[PDB]
């Protein structure tokens, strides 16, 4: 009973100087393989982030393997949320506030593929 989900309903908030992305999981199960897909046209100023026990660093376009997600027992409506700051987690200047509008208004979107066990 393997079900693959591609989630692209990432909503964005902020806490202080840092961006907070969030996507909802519509079915429970045990993740066997997860990967985040970053699509963008503008530089992300070496923004580091955390998602699903995984450290990545989005500079431009990239598809990161969410390594630490293998085995996460998710539930219905469990919100996967992570934090992201530019300059290797230093949040220097209004960069992250710019990178925010690159997420809310398109030009930078996330794509969450999950290989679960339902």
């Amino acid at each position, epitope marked *: 009973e393997v079900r693959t989900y591609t989630l692209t309903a990432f909503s964005f908030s902020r806490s202080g100087k840092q961006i907070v992305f969030s996507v909802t999981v519509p079915e429970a199960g045990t993740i066997s393989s997860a990967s985040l897909n970053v699509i963008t046209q503008n530089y992300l100023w070496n923004s580091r982030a955390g998602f699903m026990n995984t450290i990545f660093n989005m*500079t*431009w*376009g990239s598809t990161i393997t969410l390594g630490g997600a293998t085995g996460m027992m998710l539930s219905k409506g469990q919100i996967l949320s992570g934090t992201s700051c530019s300059g290797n987690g230093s949040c220097t200047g209004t960069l992250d506030d710019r990178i925010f509008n690159e997420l809310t208004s398109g030009r930078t979107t996330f794509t969450l593929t999950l290989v679960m066990q339902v």
Partner: nanobody, 120 residues
């Protein structure tokens, strides 16, 4: 002061070699990328290289183009092969200061933009 060199109208299947002129040491170990922009189209990504000499290409230019940089020359190259008529656009070169002991918000400085055209 950023600036581009190379480019100009070439026929389909031709090749061009753009070079980016980074004026000063402010650009050493700095992430720099290439962008194109046609009339009626917004600025689209093309190719980029990080300080660690990585490679970040677009999809419409994957495998056809090739980016690189000579870290000592302060020059980023974009080798364009198998050129198609959609590649006709002003090719701008952008660099991004990654906390080079700056003061204000590390802005995004660009070049002026060399012209590239592909005829049938």
């Amino acid at each position: 002061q950023l600036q581009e060199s190379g480019g100009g109208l070439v026929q389909a299947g031709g090749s061009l070699r753009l070079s980016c002129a980074a004026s000063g040491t402010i650009f050493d170990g700095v992430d720099m990328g290439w962008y194109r922009q046609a009339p009626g189209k917004e600025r689209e990504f093309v190719a980029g290289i990080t300080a660690g000499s990585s490679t970040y290409y677009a999809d419409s230019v994957k495998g056809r183009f090739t980016i690189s940089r000579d870290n000592a020359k302060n020059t980023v190259y974009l080798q364009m092969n198998s050129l198609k008529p959609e590649d006709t656009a002003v090719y701008y070169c952008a660099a991004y200061p990654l906390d080079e002991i700056g003061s204000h918000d590390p802005h995004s400085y660009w070049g002026q933009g060399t012209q590239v055209t592909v005829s049938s």
